């Protein structure tokens, strides 16, 4: 033996790598919209209960799929008109259920679409299509 | 080393960079801001 | 305890967790784990 020593060693590598983009598949995009809440308007005259907007609850898995989707296209049924397309608009990213504590999630503001100012009926036909940056629409909510 | 921050537009670095309400709403919809370099100013070295 | 005189202490905001807006029941099962910077967790609270 010879030249025995004890030395301090210093090295600070933290991550050395970053995650990929990992664009979601269609099935993941559809499952990201499985849980939802409907924002309703109830001004009491005779059970009005008209729709104001649509939430999409955030989970522990759907973050990257929800932030991948904007430009929701809606086909709803108006009070006087029938079932018709009402255009395409960007999302809004509001707090979930209006709670100051809950995080911000995708919000579809149905009052800003191409309605003639008419309310959108409840328990009628209602279709919402998520539009990807790849210009392909996927039906993510069906109410009949 | 971490990238340097650019968050002032005035000559003395005292005024932040603002955006409108509609531009903020566009940012909330997932749109991204790009950065384009148009020109660079710099010096070279000689011998006096 | 919401007292302005009392010092600031660790607080867990259960309203901000990954619930669907549902209430959290009292006198039911409830576990809280304290996660160290070393990715080690400890059962620091148990209510049954």
Automatic annotation (TrEMBL), chain B:
Superkingdom to which the source organism belongs: Bacteria
Protein name: ADP-ribosyltransferase binding component
Organism of origin: Clostridioides difficile (Peptoclostridium difficile)
Lineage: Bacteria, Bacillati, Bacillota, Clostridia, Peptostreptococcales
């Amino acid at each position: 033996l010879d030249n025995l020593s004890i030395t301090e060693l210093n090295s600070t590598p933290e991550i050395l790598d970053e995650p990929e983009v990992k664009i979601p598949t269609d099935q993941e995009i559809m499952d990201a919209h499985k849980i939802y809440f409907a924002d309703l308007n109830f001004n009491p005259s005779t059970g009005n209960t008209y729709i104001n907007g649509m939430y999409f609850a955030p989970t522990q898995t759907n973050k990257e799929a929800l932030d991948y989707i904007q430009k929701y296209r809606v086909e709803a049924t108006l009070q006087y008109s029938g079932f018709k397309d009402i255009g395409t608009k960007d999302k809004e990213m509001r707090n979930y259920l209006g709670d100051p504590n809950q995080p911000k999630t995708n919000y579809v503001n149905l009052r800003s679409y191409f309605t003639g100012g008419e309310n959108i009926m409840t328990y009628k036909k209602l279709r919402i299509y998520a539009i990807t940056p790849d210009d392909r629409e996927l039906l993510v909510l069906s109410v009949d | 080393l971490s990238p340097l921050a650019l968050n002032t537009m005035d000559q003395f670095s005292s005024r932040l960079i603002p955006i409108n309400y509609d531009q903020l709403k566009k940012l909330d919809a997932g749109k991204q801001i790009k950065l384009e370099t148009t020109q660079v100013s710099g010096n070279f070295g000689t011998k006096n």
